[PDB]
């Protein structure tokens, strides 16, 4: 984890919009740092910007086509409505390979997200009774 990545992650964590944009611009032309990097606990830039609900940072990081991965599940578990709206209209995992967006949304009684998901059309598989 280079220092040029520690500076970038710190800028994302505080909320310095101009600095994060400058780092992203200097990355696409010099290819120095890897935007898909992990900090010691394992977070990426997307997770850091979602954990603080920084909608401007989240929108910016989508305009540079970062890796999304299980970023929708994290927003659903954190119950961030704006982040879910953004992520919808666009290897180590923390979730079991059987958890889908609608299931994980239904575990949390959040009416807004559940309605937002079922408006797009989903389906939960009924298990055969015994």
């Amino acid at each position: 984890l280079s220092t040029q990545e520690k500076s970038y992650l710190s800028a994302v964590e505080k909320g310095d919009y101009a600095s994060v944009k400058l780092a992203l611009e200097e990355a696409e032309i010099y290819f120095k740092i890897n935007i898909n990097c992990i900090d010691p606990l394992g977070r990426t830039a997307l997770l850091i910007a979602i954990e603080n609900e920084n909608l401007e940072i989240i929108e910016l990081l989508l305009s540079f086509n970062v890796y999304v991965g299980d970023a929708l599940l994290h927003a659903i578990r954190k119950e961030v409505v704006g982040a879910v709206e953004l992520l919808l209209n666009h290897q180590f995992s923390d979730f079991t390979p059987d958890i889908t967006p609608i299931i994980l949304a239904a575990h949390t009684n959040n009416y807004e997200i559940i309605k937002m998901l079922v408006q797009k059309g989903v389906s939960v598989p009924q298990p055969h009774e015994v």
Binding site: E13, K14, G15, D16, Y17, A18, E51, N52, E53, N54
Partner: peptide, 22 residues
């Protein structure tokens, strides 16, 4: 998490204003 949210709001506000006056 609420405390970190409320601290980050102030941080981003400060950065934006400082950059706006310079």
């Amino acid at each position: 998490e609420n405390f970190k949210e409320l601290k980050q709001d102030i941080s981003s506000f400060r950065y934006e204003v400082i950059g706006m006056m310079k």
